[PDB]
Design a protein around this ligand. Sequence first.
Ligand SMILES: O=C(O)[C@H](CO)OP(=O)(O)O
Lengths: 249, 249
Amino acid sequence: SKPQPIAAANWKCNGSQQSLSELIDLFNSTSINHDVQCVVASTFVHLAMTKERLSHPKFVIAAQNAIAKSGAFTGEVSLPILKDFGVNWIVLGHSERRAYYGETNEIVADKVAAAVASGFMVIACIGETLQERESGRTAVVVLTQIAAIAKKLKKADWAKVVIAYEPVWAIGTGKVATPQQAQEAHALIRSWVSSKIGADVAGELRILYGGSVNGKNARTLYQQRDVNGFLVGGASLKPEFVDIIKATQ
Amino acid sequence: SKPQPIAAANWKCNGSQQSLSELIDLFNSTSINHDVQCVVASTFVHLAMTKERLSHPKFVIAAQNAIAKSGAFTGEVSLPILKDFGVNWIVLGHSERRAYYGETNEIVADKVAAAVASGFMVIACIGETLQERESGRTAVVVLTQIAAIAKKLKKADWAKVVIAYEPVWAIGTGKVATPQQAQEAHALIRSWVSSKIGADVAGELRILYGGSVNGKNARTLYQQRDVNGFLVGGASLKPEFVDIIKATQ
Ligand SMILES: O=C(O)[C@H](CO)OP(=O)(O)O
């Protein structure tokens, strides 16, 4: 027994009006009979086109990042701005933002807190690097990442939160995550929640796998106990994402 | 005898569909009988709204930031994406990005170079902090900055560049540079340009002032030799921007 799954498409910093409009069509045509929340997270530029063109009842749109308040932050986009524009999902604390854009545990937690406060559904990413892994720090890192978020939330807040575990150690490194390793990490996060926050919260919490997923391994990953879905990279700009949605059956 | 001025609205991270809509209606309604290029730089999210609603022939739209290439950069917007969307102007190296989001001279230079290569019109920002101004380091700071940019450019490229001189201490503080402070900074920039690049280039380069510019003070600022217009923050959110427009030629 699992909560509603989520299949999330992280388009990242890609796409053209053309290529996207096509994918959108594929999507809209997709026949999905189970209870799944599908999410499409496009560039800020593409939000309006994706809003207008996505008609499928199982798909919502998300942003790939935000800042808490409006004001003098040239080039950034705020939560109020996405709210007025009608976006209600958001990806926060993606590994690429932590690696290249200054996003510390604290910054992420502040973002999560504001977003929750503002009504969003949040997909909050966490996960450890090769180095952290190699030196037996998986636990230390992951739990610290989740703890920083936790300190800022109340129990009630958890209903708006999704966690996406990213095996950063296995992205761009040469390494392979097996379904077993995915699951270890997932179980560990659940334990933390269950333990620190509640069993109720824990049983209801979606923990998405944010590693390497394609249509051929998404079922075997979903087979694992603590897998509730995926945060997809590359395969999301492809038709194969349709196989990924199906794997959450 | 001055090049064509520019009045640029940098709305930064602000606004609603409705409030912006009003502005736009106001703008469209404005008769501008002199040669001036108006620029509206809105959030990524609002680019669609803007490009669809702005109809005045004297106004272009710009983005407030971008990264050079498309890829795995969650939350970021690339030049190709922008270009694909029909955006041809862009604001790069704003103090806010250098201050808060880790944008170094090298980082700004790279961005500018890439943008000039992808055919955009770039408004490259430079300016000294309070600290630096007090130390008597203004000349070093400004010229270092302009130099980093110049490194990556070829002479032809300059036709696509606009330089915005925006003393950090005047950014949304009410502390406008006096017309002498402004004119001295601008002249210093130009003299670097002629010396290093060419006199022909220099006589063509638009150098804008930015910093607590408003309807009242803009006329005097504009009278100054080396002042070719403005990068306007807070007042670009009000009808007052119109007075600003009118202040040029
Ligand atoms: O774009 C900005 O930084 C503007 C002017 O450059 O700031 P202000 O709100 O002070 O006009």
